Amino acid sequence: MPSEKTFKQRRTFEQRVEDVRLIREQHPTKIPVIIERYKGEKQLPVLDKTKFLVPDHVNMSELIKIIRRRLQLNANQAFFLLVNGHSMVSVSTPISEVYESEKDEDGFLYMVYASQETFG
């Protein structure tokens, strides 16, 4: 997915429900999360991670750190993870608690990411 075009070109909603079913069966200690760049301002690079499988005991601040580094964003470059469309950039919480709080209709969690929370 990181070398191809935008995530929907790889996998659709019902096929992401199949991903949740397979991952919950094989590795239930990891949490199913989707990640996508903000459509209103595509300022950040096309380093399309698309999804991640986070261990239960990883902090949201630690997830932010690995994802900021994988997106090549140095300390001077602005960056935010928007859980279900809203920022949690300052929070220390374990990913499972953030998950059960913001888990969507079919068992996945969403994170939109951006250089600023809104622009247009």
Partner: peptide, 17 residues
């Protein structure tokens, strides 16, 4: 490495502790 694609994948591309 594997990161984001299919099935048996290590999508966070790290060994947890």
């Amino acid at each position: 490495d594997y990161e984001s694609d299919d099935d048996s994948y290590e999508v966070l591309d790290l060994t947890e502790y």
